[PDB]
Amino acid sequence: MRGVDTFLAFKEQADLKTPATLASLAAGDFLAFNSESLSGRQQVIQSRAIRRMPMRQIAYTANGTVEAGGAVEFTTSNYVLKKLLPLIFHSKTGQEDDPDGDGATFTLVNGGVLTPFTAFVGFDGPEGKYVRRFFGAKVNQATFSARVNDMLNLNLDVQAIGKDILQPGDPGWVNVTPVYPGGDEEYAYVFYQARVLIKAGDMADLAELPVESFDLTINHNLNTNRYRLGSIYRQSLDEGVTEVTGTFTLDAAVKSISGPALNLTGGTAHDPAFLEKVALYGKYAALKLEFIDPTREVAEGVPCRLTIHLPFVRLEEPDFQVRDPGVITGSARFNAYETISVTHVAKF
Amino acid sequence: MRGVDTFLAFKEQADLKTPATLASLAAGDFLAFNSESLSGRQQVIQSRAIRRMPMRQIAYTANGTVEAGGAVEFTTSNYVLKKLLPLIFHSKTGQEDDPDGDGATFTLVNGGVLTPFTAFVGFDGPEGKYVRRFFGAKVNQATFSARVNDMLNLNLDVQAIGKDILQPGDPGWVNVTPVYPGGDEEYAYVFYQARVLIKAGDMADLAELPVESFDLTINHNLNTNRYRLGSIYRQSLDEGVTEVTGTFTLDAAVKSISGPALNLTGGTAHDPAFLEKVALYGKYAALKLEFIDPTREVAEGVPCRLTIHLPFVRLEEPDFQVRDPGVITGSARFNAYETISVTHVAKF
Amino acid sequence: MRGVDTFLAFKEQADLKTPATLASLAAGDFLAFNSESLSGRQQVIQSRAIRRMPMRQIAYTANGTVEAGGAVEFTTSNYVLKKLLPLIFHSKTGQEDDPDGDGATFTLVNGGVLTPFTAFVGFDGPEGKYVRRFFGAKVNQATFSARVNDMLNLNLDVQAIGKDILQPGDPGWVNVTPVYPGGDEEYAYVFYQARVLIKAGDMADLAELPVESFDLTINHNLNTNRYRLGSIYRQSLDEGVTEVTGTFTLDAAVKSISGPALNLTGGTAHDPAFLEKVALYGKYAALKLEFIDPTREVAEGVPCRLTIHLPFVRLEEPDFQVRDPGVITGSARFNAYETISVTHVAKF
Amino acid sequence: MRGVDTFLAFKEQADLKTPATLASLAAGDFLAFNSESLSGRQQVIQSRAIRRMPMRQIAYTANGTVEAGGAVEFTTSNYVLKKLLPLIFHSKTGQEDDPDGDGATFTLVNGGVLTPFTAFVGFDGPEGKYVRRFFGAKVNQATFSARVNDMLNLNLDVQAIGKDILQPGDPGWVNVTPVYPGGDEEYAYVFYQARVLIKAGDMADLAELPVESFDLTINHNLNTNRYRLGSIYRQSLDEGVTEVTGTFTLDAAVKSISGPALNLTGGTAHDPAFLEKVALYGKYAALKLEFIDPTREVAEGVPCRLTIHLPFVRLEEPDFQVRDPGVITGSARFNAYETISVTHVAKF
Amino acid sequence: MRGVDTFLAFKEQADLKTPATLASLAAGDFLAFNSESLSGRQQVIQSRAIRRMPMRQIAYTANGTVEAGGAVEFTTSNYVLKKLLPLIFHSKTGQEDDPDGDGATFTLVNGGVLTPFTAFVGFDGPEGKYVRRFFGAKVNQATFSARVNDMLNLNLDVQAIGKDILQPGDPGWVNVTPVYPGGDEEYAYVFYQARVLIKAGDMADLAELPVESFDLTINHNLNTNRYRLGSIYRQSLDEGVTEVTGTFTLDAAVKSISGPALNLTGGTAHDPAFLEKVALYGKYAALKLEFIDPTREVAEGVPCRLTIHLPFVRLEEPDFQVRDPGVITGSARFNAYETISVTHVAKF
């Protein structure tokens, strides 16, 4: 088996306890991934009765509860986002390829819930065919990462109810053919399209920051321990409170590339302790991570675009340590507070 | 001091509390090792009485209990095994160099106990002569490791009662000369002699697995905390339940090199999810780690051989992650259940 | 032994692990080569056990894993290509000597694999007869080179599983007589038959470039490290992703010999920064390396021909350094992207 | 294109990110060079998503960050120095052609910075006209070399932000005519004008060394890796610490041509281990590389002169190996420590 | 200074840390050499404290640890060997000029050590007198080389503790006069006296090989990094394990000049794949490099002779590449295993 012999497919299922059938997979369900580490784990229960025994005996063990899930890395692209953003957020308004050019907005809602899906990890090649199926899956975490000389990456952390294998001859077995978007229809988001804009204090507009990298994790804190007496499986994946944190690396005392000067008073003079003072006075900033593809247009003059709005964010001490006589660089961590909104304008 | 200036010697002592004498060492007691890290440690007790003091004062400290032991690595060889297998297992039946060619079998027995021994780490050279003696030693763990382009390694984890130094002029000092087997009498077990055979489900015979490496730890879980009021030494090293775990690295959806096809039904068709299904259905497999030296014969046609039988083994999710577009490889951990049996056929 | 006393022979074997027999060699298996450097290499394992020793002792060494392979240079000719092109590419459609004059096309296919073969390097003469046999061989790299006042050369880089020697008295020994094509049937491809044509931007047709030389390497990136415990041999030669790079030397600001003018807009005016702009704007060009032999015809009016199509190619900064007051010359490296197609029209 | 068809021009730009216009070039901007190797390089990013593919596909590549720069060799002359010394050093005091005859002194200052410039490499001739423009260029290294039967050479190593091509019809295109100094106004510095003077220990004055050649590199250690998310270009070329090293070849146990005797005590007796003892006792010497043109005078009796003061220098083991029965010769490397000062007295 | 103005002298010192005095040099200490490259090197430590500075400042540097040593080439001769063989090997038995004609045998012993010596490189002539002294020197490597139309060469690689210069007026200065053996007493070993004999498999005696050249390196792997806090000098030169490798160039499928036929079975028929099969089957051969001077006799009929016994040697793939249609020639590398023994029979 080689990695190229495997296909990944997500399929939104109706209920958490009813897997999607292998026969329902179609176009848009198959995703190209960088790596997947989904696996199941079962507990082994040993009897506590005292017994003289050199090793552990087969007659006194029982199979305990079952866990499942893992990580999947993606290269955030046209169709990857179309598939996965509905799985990460609670609501969606609009269509990405809308002709007016407003795209689809994904947000968290008060009593919102996550869509459960079935993750298929199918195989093929000289050895034979079989499909790992992870039913009742939910997205526990989602990290957006942007580095230089890289593409926008998305690392999902999935929690499923259970795993099972499917093979030729099984009842629900169907010979699926992975169908993917053409090379011309699909495109990725690259580092040279990224923009990080900040706005704290009495700044009038968002000012662009020269950052070297950025991360953004949406953590849904699923309750992965709801077990029952008559079952070995999880009985739910209840989503807790969503923690939206992140990071970005930049230099100390940086000026803005565009927009107003970084000044907590709205003045024109640059503030060399801007981020340090934002972290030290407990002020709330407004981040905006934006990817724009000008070569591609959704409307007459509307470009394809992925935007992440964080209207209320609290920075931590930016970590501008003097390590050596070079340029002082560091990473500024933050926590998003009130709302998170992802807009995706794209043509498929 | 250089490593070549040191000798290691194990000497089986009668009782746990009576060290072997330096004068009793003879041929077969001295072993060639890759490395040893045996050391003693004593506790320092501070008085809890309140006292104004900038630092800790000498008058209010006392010496507490004493620990000892460490690790010793060996290149599993002819004589290394002859010496160490009786120290790792509870029973032994037969002689390795028996002319019929059945070798000696080492197993764990119900009320079995471990042999205590004295480990001597002697030194020599320009600096002078002295011997570290670790009395009341027992084997806590023993890991067999086989890599490619390597020899079979054995890492012992020893727990002793105490340490003491011996020097010219001490009462029990004797000038020992390490005596080792000739280069022609002694031989090691190499990677190209190894065979890993499995058998699960309704398979008829053991099928050979192409594995890249394998590990096997026998953990005796000694109770290393039996202390007494009138003594600083451990009062026993009570052996708990023996945990026999292991690992082996191989590719995903591997066929067998020899024997029946890997199929949990005994059929002829190959099963690409064999190990995954074994781990997922909680089935018990039968491992066999075997080293055969055909160039060396114990009887008319019986070759020297080291075999490890694990008739009942439970695999964990084999860890066949799709990390990249190359070959899918992973490590399959397991736990042995009912019995462990090591057979050693060798001529000395 | 003189070079003229040696013969080379490639024999396509069925499986990677089953060498071809010396008795199966026939016409077309024997190839005339410029040079061969195929050799085997075995690892020597030293025991890590500490031992006082001035030098390394025989009793504590073991033979490790085995490598094989090397390079073979050929003068790309009628029969050399007929033999070797099936070994370099995954698919072949048609026959070179087809009467319609379309020749055979060799391309890489998605799940394609390389043909394993056995390379015989036999000897003869006053000393005696013996044959080096390299079984399980695969083509790792293949470089086509064209210089002025030279013939088209082909340098193969071979990776085999192992080597073995055959001599009179061995079981599989047969007295082979190298049989080669007549001097009239065989012909080579010379420098004055070469044509390099390019096409980038909005150019309508392929324009001929006056180049001084060109190279083209097809690198299959075989995985030459799949080793196993119970064996000293490689267990496979898995082919990775094929890297098709190349080079050609030419002058700076060259006009085309024939075809449209070198202009990324399709105009008639010559563009003196054509290749520099192609490299600087990241444009994809279409190369065509073609050898035509008009004196030799396959059909009524179809000449023998070797063509290499590279429909998508990315140039690097052409390296047009001003080194002195003479003509500015340099080498333009490139990487082929989507597909590679070699057509061979030839009569045997 | 021939080398004589090309012109080089340096133009000091105001900011690092604003190229100089082709219309601003005037007299003194065009320099005669021995050779130039300035070029740009862009990174190609491949998507890490797994995909079955024989070669690399166009749809899954992106253009990464951009590098630029290279080397330019000059024959250190009247105007070459006038142009380039301000680009190599941080400060300048005075005018070279000052009538008092003190010339201009170039030194490194504590918080000093390097002047960014735009390097134009224009072309012309039968093929057509186009200009390579390297904006945001800085001098990374500068090596002064003096050999026998040669002229003083200067090899610059330039680091730029990016490259771009200019052609008739572009917006910023202007038909520039290279204007150079007359043959009578311009002159070079030759080997027979050089003087190397040393002074270590308690020597009273500088003593002249008979050296065969000398080199002097000023390395500014620019930080060429400051990249940003929203851009493919370098965001700065921050200059680190300037390393001033060098070399000079001479014989072993050389006497001084003029000045005091080479004696670390200031005595009159010659010291045959002078340089060996300077290197072995870690002493600091004072070098002076001086070129004097007596035929040319700036004031009534002040000759044109290029002087390089290295008041604190540490030699390495002079490398006076006994290679054969001839004269023992070797090269003495050194590192300059506290300051470097270049004085240029010249009339234009 | 000319090479003829220099003298080399080795003087065996008692301890590694006590240099030999210049007054102790006598006859036999002075050696004629082809070339010497012994030199010292001191480390320069820079302070890591951050400081604004254009260049490196004198006040913040310190002198670090000191290295010494280099290479010396000799023409292996009567007295050169008498002096140097005791420095390369651990033991010596007998006298070279013994009247019975058995010479002296030099071997490596288990706990053997190398003799430390002081190397003087003195100078003289018009410039003045001074002596480089390298104390605590040891032989790290020693390569014996024999080419055609050459003399037996010996290249030593020396590691010393430190260097120092001596001059008239120093305390330990003495005016030494190099005293050398007469031209009649001294003689060298030439290529036409060499014999390379091999013996592998079941061969009965040693068979002579027609080789074009041979090399033999004895590498003692000294530990040259034993440094201490309170000192800038190495604290020891601990000798590791001695690696004895070598090479010899010869033709492919060579017959023996004298002795039994090259046949791994002891038969009379010549084996054209002898060395290839020795390398491919991992067999151990027995080399013997012998120089005999029949014109010179130590006893009534015993000739002066230098013999190197390598009773256990492992060849590598002899490198018999078919490069062209001429004679197939190559170099056979090897590693010596168990022991090395050098016998020197000579009259002085």
CSV table of N, CA, C and O in Angstrom, one decimal, chain C residues 179-240:
chain,number,residue,atom,x,y,z
C,179,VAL,N,25.4,-12.3,-29.7
C,179,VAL,CA,24.9,-12.0,-31.0
C,179,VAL,C,24.4,-10.6,-31.2
C,179,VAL,O,23.5,-10.2,-30.4
C,180,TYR,N,25.0,-9.9,-32.1
C,180,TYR,CA,24.7,-8.5,-32.3
C,180,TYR,C,24.1,-8.2,-33.7
C,180,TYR,O,24.3,-9.0,-34.6
C,181,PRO,N,23.4,-7.1,-33.8
C,181,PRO,CA,22.9,-6.7,-35.2
C,181,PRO,C,24.0,-6.4,-36.1
C,181,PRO,O,25.1,-5.9,-35.7
C,182,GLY,N,23.8,-6.7,-37.4
C,182,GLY,CA,24.8,-6.3,-38.4
C,182,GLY,C,25.1,-4.8,-38.4
C,182,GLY,O,24.3,-4.0,-37.8
C,183,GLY,N,26.2,-4.5,-39.0
C,183,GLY,CA,26.5,-3.1,-39.2
C,183,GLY,C,25.6,-2.3,-40.1
C,183,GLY,O,25.4,-1.1,-39.9
C,184,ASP,N,24.9,-3.0,-41.0
C,184,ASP,CA,24.0,-2.4,-41.9
C,184,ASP,C,22.6,-2.2,-41.3
C,184,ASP,O,21.9,-1.2,-41.6
C,185,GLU,N,22.2,-3.1,-40.4
C,185,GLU,CA,20.9,-3.0,-39.8
C,185,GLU,C,20.9,-1.9,-38.7
C,185,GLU,O,19.8,-1.3,-38.5
C,186,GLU,N,22.0,-1.7,-38.1
C,186,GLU,CA,22.0,-0.8,-36.9
C,186,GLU,C,22.6,0.5,-37.3
C,186,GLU,O,23.4,0.7,-38.2
C,187,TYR,N,22.0,1.6,-36.7
C,187,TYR,CA,22.5,2.9,-36.9
C,187,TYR,C,22.3,3.8,-35.6
C,187,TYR,O,21.4,3.4,-34.8
C,188,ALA,N,23.0,4.8,-35.5
C,188,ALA,CA,23.0,5.7,-34.3
C,188,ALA,C,22.4,7.0,-34.7
C,188,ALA,O,22.2,7.4,-35.9
C,189,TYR,N,22.1,7.8,-33.7
C,189,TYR,CA,21.6,9.2,-33.8
C,189,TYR,C,22.7,10.2,-33.5
C,189,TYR,O,23.3,10.1,-32.5
C,190,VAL,N,22.9,11.1,-34.5
C,190,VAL,CA,24.1,11.9,-34.4
C,190,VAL,C,23.6,13.4,-34.1
C,190,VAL,O,22.4,13.7,-34.1
C,191,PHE,N,24.6,14.2,-33.8
C,191,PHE,CA,24.3,15.6,-33.4
C,191,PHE,C,23.6,16.4,-34.5
C,191,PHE,O,22.8,17.2,-34.2
C,192,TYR,N,24.0,16.2,-35.7
C,192,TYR,CA,23.5,17.0,-36.8
C,192,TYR,C,22.1,16.5,-37.3
C,192,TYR,O,21.6,17.1,-38.3
C,193,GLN,N,21.5,15.6,-36.5
C,193,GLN,CA,20.1,15.3,-36.7
C,193,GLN,C,19.2,15.8,-35.7
C,193,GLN,O,18.0,15.7,-35.8
C,194,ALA,N,19.7,16.5,-34.6
C,194,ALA,CA,19.0,17.0,-33.5
C,194,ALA,C,18.3,18.3,-33.8
C,194,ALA,O,18.7,19.1,-34.7
C,195,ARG,N,17.1,18.5,-33.2
C,195,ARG,CA,16.4,19.7,-33.3
C,195,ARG,C,15.8,20.0,-31.9
C,195,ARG,O,15.1,19.1,-31.3
C,196,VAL,N,15.9,21.2,-31.4
C,196,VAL,CA,15.3,21.6,-30.2
C,196,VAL,C,14.3,22.7,-30.5
C,196,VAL,O,14.7,23.8,-31.1
C,197,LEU,N,13.0,22.5,-30.3
C,197,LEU,CA,12.0,23.4,-30.6
C,197,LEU,C,11.3,23.8,-29.3
C,197,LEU,O,11.1,23.0,-28.4
C,198,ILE,N,10.9,25.1,-29.2
C,198,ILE,CA,10.3,25.6,-28.0
C,198,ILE,C,9.0,26.3,-28.4
C,198,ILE,O,8.8,26.6,-29.6
C,199,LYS,N,8.2,26.6,-27.4
C,199,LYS,CA,6.9,27.3,-27.7
C,199,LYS,C,6.3,27.7,-26.3
C,199,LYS,O,5.9,26.9,-25.6
C,200,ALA,N,6.4,29.0,-26.1
C,200,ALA,CA,5.8,29.5,-24.8
C,200,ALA,C,4.9,30.7,-25.2
C,200,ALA,O,4.8,31.2,-26.3
C,201,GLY,N,4.2,31.2,-24.2
C,201,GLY,CA,3.3,32.3,-24.4
C,201,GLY,C,2.2,32.0,-25.4
C,201,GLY,O,1.6,30.9,-25.4
C,202,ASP,N,1.9,33.0,-26.2
C,202,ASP,CA,0.9,32.8,-27.3
C,202,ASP,C,1.5,32.5,-28.6
C,202,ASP,O,0.9,32.7,-29.6
C,203,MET,N,2.7,31.9,-28.6
C,203,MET,CA,3.3,31.4,-29.9
C,203,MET,C,2.4,30.4,-30.5
C,203,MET,O,1.8,29.6,-29.8
C,204,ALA,N,2.3,30.5,-31.8
C,204,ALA,CA,1.4,29.6,-32.6
C,204,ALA,C,1.9,28.2,-32.8
C,204,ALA,O,1.2,27.3,-32.7
C,205,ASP,N,3.2,28.1,-33.2
C,205,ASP,CA,3.8,26.9,-33.5
C,205,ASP,C,5.1,26.7,-32.6
C,205,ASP,O,5.4,27.6,-31.9
C,206,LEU,N,5.8,25.6,-32.8
C,206,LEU,CA,7.1,25.4,-32.2
C,206,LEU,C,8.2,26.1,-33.0
C,206,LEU,O,8.3,25.8,-34.2
C,207,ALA,N,9.0,26.9,-32.4
C,207,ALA,CA,10.1,27.5,-33.0
C,207,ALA,C,11.4,26.8,-32.7
C,207,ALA,O,11.6,26.4,-31.5
C,208,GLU,N,12.3,26.6,-33.7
C,208,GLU,CA,13.5,25.9,-33.5
C,208,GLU,C,14.6,26.8,-32.8
C,208,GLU,O,14.8,27.9,-33.3
C,209,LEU,N,15.2,26.3,-31.8
C,209,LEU,CA,16.3,27.0,-31.1
C,209,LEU,C,17.7,26.5,-31.6
C,209,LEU,O,17.9,25.3,-31.7
C,210,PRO,N,18.6,27.4,-31.8
C,210,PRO,CA,20.0,27.0,-32.0
C,210,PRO,C,20.7,26.7,-30.7
C,210,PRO,O,21.2,27.6,-30.1
C,211,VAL,N,20.7,25.5,-30.3
C,211,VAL,CA,21.4,25.1,-29.0
C,211,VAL,C,22.7,24.4,-29.3
C,211,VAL,O,22.8,23.7,-30.3
C,212,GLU,N,23.6,24.5,-28.4
C,212,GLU,CA,24.9,23.8,-28.6
C,212,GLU,C,24.9,22.4,-28.0
C,212,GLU,O,25.6,21.5,-28.5
C,213,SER,N,24.1,22.2,-27.0
C,213,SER,CA,24.0,20.8,-26.4
C,213,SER,C,22.7,20.8,-25.6
C,213,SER,O,22.0,21.8,-25.4
C,214,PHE,N,22.3,19.6,-25.2
C,214,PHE,CA,21.1,19.4,-24.4
C,214,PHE,C,21.3,18.1,-23.6
C,214,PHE,O,21.9,17.2,-24.0
C,215,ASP,N,20.7,18.1,-22.4
C,215,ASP,CA,20.6,16.9,-21.5
C,215,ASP,C,19.1,16.7,-21.1
C,215,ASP,O,18.4,17.7,-21.0
C,216,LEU,N,18.8,15.5,-20.8
C,216,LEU,CA,17.5,15.2,-20.3
C,216,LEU,C,17.6,14.0,-19.4
C,216,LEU,O,17.8,12.9,-19.9
C,217,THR,N,17.3,14.2,-18.1
C,217,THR,CA,17.3,13.1,-17.2
C,217,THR,C,15.9,12.7,-16.8
C,217,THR,O,15.1,13.6,-16.4
C,218,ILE,N,15.6,11.4,-16.8
C,218,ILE,CA,14.4,10.9,-16.3
C,218,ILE,C,14.7,10.1,-15.0
C,218,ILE,O,15.4,9.1,-15.1
C,219,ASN,N,14.4,10.7,-13.8
C,219,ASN,CA,14.7,10.1,-12.5
C,219,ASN,C,13.5,9.5,-11.9
C,219,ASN,O,12.5,10.3,-11.6
C,220,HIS,N,13.5,8.2,-11.7
C,220,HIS,CA,12.3,7.5,-11.1
C,220,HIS,C,12.3,7.4,-9.6
C,220,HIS,O,11.3,6.9,-9.1
C,221,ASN,N,13.4,7.9,-8.9
C,221,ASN,CA,13.4,7.9,-7.5
C,221,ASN,C,13.0,6.6,-6.9
C,221,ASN,O,12.0,6.5,-6.1
C,222,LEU,N,13.7,5.5,-7.2
C,222,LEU,CA,13.4,4.2,-6.6
C,222,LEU,C,13.7,4.2,-5.2
C,222,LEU,O,14.7,4.9,-4.7
C,223,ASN,N,12.9,3.5,-4.4
C,223,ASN,CA,13.2,3.4,-2.9
C,223,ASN,C,14.1,2.2,-2.8
C,223,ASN,O,13.7,1.0,-2.9
C,224,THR,N,15.4,2.5,-2.5
C,224,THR,CA,16.4,1.5,-2.5
C,224,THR,C,16.8,1.1,-1.0
C,224,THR,O,18.0,0.9,-0.7
C,225,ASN,N,15.8,1.1,-0.1
C,225,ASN,CA,16.1,0.9,1.3
C,225,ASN,C,15.1,0.0,2.0
C,225,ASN,O,14.9,0.1,3.2
C,226,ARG,N,14.3,-0.7,1.2
C,226,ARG,CA,13.3,-1.6,1.8
C,226,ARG,C,14.0,-2.9,2.2
C,226,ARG,O,14.1,-3.8,1.3
C,227,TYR,N,14.4,-3.0,3.4
C,227,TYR,CA,15.1,-4.2,3.9
C,227,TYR,C,14.2,-4.9,5.0
C,227,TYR,O,13.3,-4.3,5.6
C,228,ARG,N,14.6,-6.1,5.3
C,228,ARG,CA,13.7,-7.0,6.1
C,228,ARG,C,14.6,-7.7,7.1
C,228,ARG,O,15.9,-7.6,7.0
C,229,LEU,N,14.1,-8.2,8.2
C,229,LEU,CA,14.9,-8.9,9.1
C,229,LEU,C,15.5,-10.1,8.6
C,229,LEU,O,16.7,-10.1,8.4
C,230,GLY,N,14.7,-11.1,8.0
C,230,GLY,CA,15.3,-12.4,7.7
C,230,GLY,C,16.0,-12.4,6.4
C,230,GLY,O,16.2,-13.5,5.9
C,231,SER,N,16.5,-11.3,5.9
C,231,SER,CA,17.1,-11.3,4.6
C,231,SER,C,18.2,-10.2,4.5
C,231,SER,O,18.1,-9.2,5.2
C,232,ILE,N,19.2,-10.4,3.7
C,232,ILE,CA,20.2,-9.4,3.4
C,232,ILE,C,19.9,-8.6,2.2
C,232,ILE,O,20.7,-7.6,1.9
C,233,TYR,N,18.9,-8.9,1.4
C,233,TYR,CA,18.6,-8.3,0.1
C,233,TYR,C,17.5,-7.3,0.3
C,233,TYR,O,16.6,-7.4,1.2
C,234,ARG,N,17.4,-6.4,-0.7
C,234,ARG,CA,16.3,-5.5,-0.8
C,234,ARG,C,15.1,-6.3,-1.1
C,234,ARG,O,15.1,-7.2,-1.9
C,235,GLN,N,13.9,-5.9,-0.6
C,235,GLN,CA,12.7,-6.6,-0.8
C,235,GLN,C,11.8,-5.9,-1.9
C,235,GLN,O,10.8,-6.5,-2.3
C,236,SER,N,12.2,-4.8,-2.4
C,236,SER,CA,11.5,-4.2,-3.5
C,236,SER,C,12.4,-3.0,-4.0
C,236,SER,O,13.3,-2.6,-3.3
C,237,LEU,N,12.0,-2.5,-5.2
C,237,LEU,CA,12.6,-1.2,-5.7
C,237,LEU,C,11.4,-0.4,-6.1
C,237,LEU,O,11.1,-0.2,-7.3
C,238,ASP,N,10.7,0.2,-5.1
C,238,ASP,CA,9.5,0.9,-5.3
C,238,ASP,C,9.8,2.2,-6.0
C,238,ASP,O,10.6,3.0,-5.5
C,239,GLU,N,9.2,2.5,-7.1
C,239,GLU,CA,9.4,3.7,-7.9
C,239,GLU,C,8.5,4.9,-7.3
C,239,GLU,O,7.3,4.7,-7.2
C,240,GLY,N,9.2,6.0,-7.0
C,240,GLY,CA,8.5,7.1,-6.5
C,240,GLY,C,7.9,8.0,-7.6
C,240,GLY,O,7.3,7.5,-8.5
